[PDB]
Design a protein around this ligand. Structure first.
Ligand SMILES: [Cu+2]
Length: 114
């Protein structure tokens, strides 16, 4: 339970099926962990890295000991796919973050202006 999240939101996408989510995970513990999956009732969620403006899926991204994992625009991000409609300002998406070596963490991601 030494993992916590802040800086969590979704910019309003120009899409009725896909969106990027940002958040920062902080690890106050002595041992590193991995984000192993993310679940949501809104759609399917995967972790992407950004590599010269291209996106790449990654299965098990590291959250370093006494460190933080930042998901932000043009870097690492959650990718929501198979959404049913365009997420809009006023709505929030809940996800659950699952870890290799720690309990799950629920996060709320409000949809913000793009
Ligand atoms: Cu992506």
């Amino acid at each position: 339970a030494e993992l916590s999240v802040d800086a969590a939101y979704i910019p309003q996408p120009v899409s009725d099926s896909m969106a990027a989510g940002f958040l920062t995970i902080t690890n106050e513990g002595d041992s590193a962990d991995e984000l192993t999956s993310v679940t949501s009732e809104a759609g399917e969620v995967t972790v992407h890295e950004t590599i010269d403006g291209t996106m790449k899926e990654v299965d098990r991204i590291e959250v370093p000991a006494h460190g933080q994992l930042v998901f932000k625009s043009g870097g690492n991000h959650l990718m929501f796919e198979k959404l049913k409609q365009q997420p809009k300002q006023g709505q929030s998406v809940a996800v659950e973050l699952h870890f290799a070596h720690s309990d799950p963490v629920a996060v709320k991601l409000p949809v913000k202006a793009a």
